[PDB]
């Protein structure tokens, strides 16, 4: 498996756009690598169609999308025609699909599904998401099972958080949506906070400390 | 780290309720173990206060809740009074907080924060969530960094999925909300699916396959 902060592997893999070297394909850019158990399966089709529907939304944020399963590239090309169809959107598939047939990414990234295997007991990936920064480090990950489809609104939400918190001395609270107030991180001094966050409110708490500090969302 | 389907470790840890043997505290019941970087920090208080607001929701689904940081039990009890106050709810902490002072769970669970350390460079945990079943296996996990507060409604959403998809041969699609229709798992034959799901729609796709099967939320 892969812990937060680690350089994401620079793997060579075959895909729907040919062989790709991961770090080269991503470049100086945010990326989201997401996996699914198997092609020609229903939840996976709703998810990958949903991602097509939301392509514009990841694009506005400069995030590159790439999907992955252990199926061959022939199965990825055929199945995309179903994915496209369900999306309702016209045109070519706007993201690649990796064929992890050797199961090297499955095992390395710790994204093997506990219940789903091939007819021959071969392993399969689950529903993983890896959010990768411009420095190639893993910033956030989820590991959902075959049974449970993902929530792409939440993915976009935590992207908004990560992109803002990379750039400003803030952290986003429970259930934050863009444009809600953020928390001033505990490492900013009372003195540093006077210039950086003029409009901060310190809200009092029984313990007396001065840590519960809110500020408007900064223009990033 | 911990992969999906692994038996969650039967760890002994101190807490705000004394030493815990994890599988003994859990008993035969779903549980959610969730971590936070450090007590007396702003985002961590908003999330732990929101858990208190939601504890009845977790109780209704039979989910035991348990928090964790690398702080000591005394800090946990002092700070618990600030979390209570943010929450708006009067009464006793409805969930334990584990002290992982050695960082042995931090490291075993693959939940070190990439960025946050103590003033001397010691590891702290990220915002990790693990959903463990009555069988003690890991069903889903998330790893969010200190920068990015979690969405505890997404946790409830995925619990509902996990619970329902353990009762019925269905899988929850992208962005599913309880009461929406699910997908019939692809492994289910044509003749079983017709026996179990009478209001099933089979949606024609360009590939001619018959996997894209919906069922109005099955009897639950």
Whether the Cβ atoms of residue B50 and residue B83 lie closer than 8 Å to each other: no
Whether the Cβ atoms of residue A172 and residue A164 lie closer than 8 Å to each other: yes
Residue of B46, B151, B183 with shortest CB distance to A43: B183
What does the domain layout of chain A look like in residue ranges?
1-150, 151-220
DSSP code for A220: -
Task: Cite the DSSP H helix spans in chain B.
Answer: 22-26, 42-60, 73-87, 104-108, 152-167, 190-196
Dist. CA A124–CA A138, nearest whole Å: 22
Q: Which residues of A touch B1 (CB under 8 A)?
A: 1-3, 110
Residues 6+ apart with CB under 8 A from A201: A213, A214, A215
Dist. CA A83–CA A68, nearest whole Å: 14
The nearest CA of chain B is from the CA of A18 a distance in Å of 22
For the domain with range A151-220, which CATH number is right: 2.10.50.10, 3.30.200.20, 3.30.1020.10, 3.40.50.450?
3.30.1020.10
Tell me whether residue B43 is exposed, middle or buried, using C-beta atoms within 10 angstroms of its C-beta: 0 to 12, 13 to 18, 19 or more. buried
Whether the Cβ atoms of residue B202 and residue B194 lie closer than 8 Å to each other: no
Whether the Cβ atoms of residue B175 and residue B198 lie closer than 8 Å to each other: no
Gap sites in chain A (C to N > 2.5 Å), preceding residue numbers: none
Closest CA to B159 of B62, B94, B75: B62
Closest CA to B95 of B158, B150, B20: B20
B172 touches chain A (CB under 8 A): yes
Task: Cite the DSSP H helix spans in chain A.
Answer: 22-26, 42-53, 55-60, 73-87, 104-108, 152-165, 193-196
Question: Under an 8 A CB cutoff, do B145 and A46 touch?
Answer: no
Distances (CA, A) of B38 to A195, B12, B108, B128, B152: 26, 20, 18, 13, 19
How many alpha carbons fall within 13 Å on the CB side of residue A74? Answer: 0
> Which conformational region is residue A138 in: left (phi greater than 0), alpha (psi within -120 to 50 degrees), or beta?
beta
Residue of B151, B152, B207 with shortest CB distance to A157: B151
Residue of A153, A161, A171 with shortest CB distance to B42: A171
Dist. CA A124–CA B162, nearest whole Å: 19
DSSP code for A7: B
Q: What angle do the packed helices A42-53 and A152-165 form, to 10 degrees? A: 50
What is the dihedral sign for C-alpha B41, B141, B32, B103?
Answer: negative
Which residue bears the tokens 């729609």?
B201
Closest CA to B153 of B50, B8, B63, B67: B50
Cα B6 from chain centre: 15
Question: Under an 8 A CB cutoff, do B207 and A79 touch?
Answer: yes
Q: Burial code of B157-195, b = ≥16 C-beta within 10 A, e = fewer?
A: bbbbbbbbbeebbbbbbbbbeeeebbbbbbebeeeebee
Dist. CA A133–CA B114, nearest whole Å: 13
Dist. CA A207–CA B78, nearest whole Å: 7
Q: Identify from A143, A174, A212 which residue to disrupt to test chain B contact, counting B C-beta atoms within 10 A and taking the largest count.
A: A174
Dist. CA A124–CA A39, nearest whole Å: 11
Question: Under an 8 A CB cutoff, do A110 and B148 touch?
Answer: no
Whether the Cβ atoms of residue A128 and residue B152 lie closer than 8 Å to each other: no
Residue of A49, A111, A207 with shortest CB distance to B82: A207
What are the tokens at A59? 């694009």
Bridge partner list, B12 = B21
Q: What angle do CA B42, B13, A205 make, to 5 degrees?
A: 20
- Whether the domain at A1-150 and the domain at A151-220 fall into the same CATH topology: no
A137-140 own/partner pairs: CB under 8 Å, 24+ apart: A137/A5, A137/A6, A137/A7, A137/A8, A137/B114, A138/A2, A138/A3, A138/A4, A138/A5, A138/A6, A138/A8, A139/A4, A139/B114, A139/B145, A140/A4, A140/B143, A140/B144, A140/B145, A140/B148
Strand arrangement of the beta sheet that strand A213-215 belongs to: A170-171, A182-184, A213-215, A201-202
Whether the Cβ atoms of residue B112 and residue A3 lie closer than 8 Å to each other: yes
Tell me the CATH number for domain B1-150: 3.40.30.10
């Amino acid at each position: 498996g892969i812990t937060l902060g680690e350089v994401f592997p620079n793997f060579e893999a075959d895909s729907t756009i040919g062989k790709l070297k991961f770090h080269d394909w991503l470049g100086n850019s945010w990326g989201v690598l997401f996996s699914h158990p198997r092609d020609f399966t229903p939840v996976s089709t709703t998810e990958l169609g949903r991602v097509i529907q939301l392509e514009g939304d990841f694009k506005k944020r400069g995030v590159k999308l790439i999907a992955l399963s252990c199926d061959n590239v022939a199965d990825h090309k055929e199945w995309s025609e179903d994915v496209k169809c369900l999306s309702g959107v016209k045109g070519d598939m706007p993201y690649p699909i990796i064929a992890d047939e050797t199961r090297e990414l499955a095992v390395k990234l710790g994204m093997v599904d506990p219940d789903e295997r091939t007819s021959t007991g071969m392993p399969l990936t689950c529903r993983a998401v890896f959010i990768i920064g411009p420095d190639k480090k893993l910033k956030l990950s989820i590991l959902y099972p075959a049974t449970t489809g993902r929530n792409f609104s939440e993915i976009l939400r935590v992207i908004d958080s990560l992109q803002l918190t990379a750039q400003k001395k803030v952290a986003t609270p429970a259930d934050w949506q863009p444009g809600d107030r953020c928390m001033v991180v505990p490492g900013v001094s009372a003195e540093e906070a006077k210039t950086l966050f003029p409009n901060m409110e310190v809200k009092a708490v029984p313990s007396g400390k001065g840590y519960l500090r809110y500020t408007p969302q900064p223009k990033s």
